[PDB]
Design a protein around this ligand. Sequence first.
Ligand code: HEC
Length: 86
Amino acid sequence: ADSVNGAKIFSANCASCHAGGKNLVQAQKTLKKADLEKYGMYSAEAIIAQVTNGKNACPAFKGRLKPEQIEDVAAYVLGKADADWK
Ligand code: HEC
């Protein structure tokens, strides 16, 4: 996984709803470490599955992003959650 490529994917695909690690559509479901842990989403496998397939109003990216790009953005988010958002 390549977090730097991940940041690029995040800017292009995720910041519309998750700028600042927030969630503009479902406010408590943020990208902060504490929230990812709380909801069982603090792992690459968990983020990949949800980004790929979607969940409620979290859009699915299967076929819109390549599998490796989904992997990269999951690594970014975990890194960011660890360093800056929490
Ligand atoms: C709005 C149009 C969104 C875009 C663009 C992306 N996400 Fe999202 N995300 C969105 C919602 C409404 C929710 C909550 C869904 C629910 O009902 O539970 C989510 C949730 C996530 C989560 C889970 C966060 C948590 O605290 O549990 C993750 C990890 C996540 N979203 C990641 C993510 C990525 C990497 C994105 C771009 C590729 C992305 N999301 C786009 C809404 C939207």
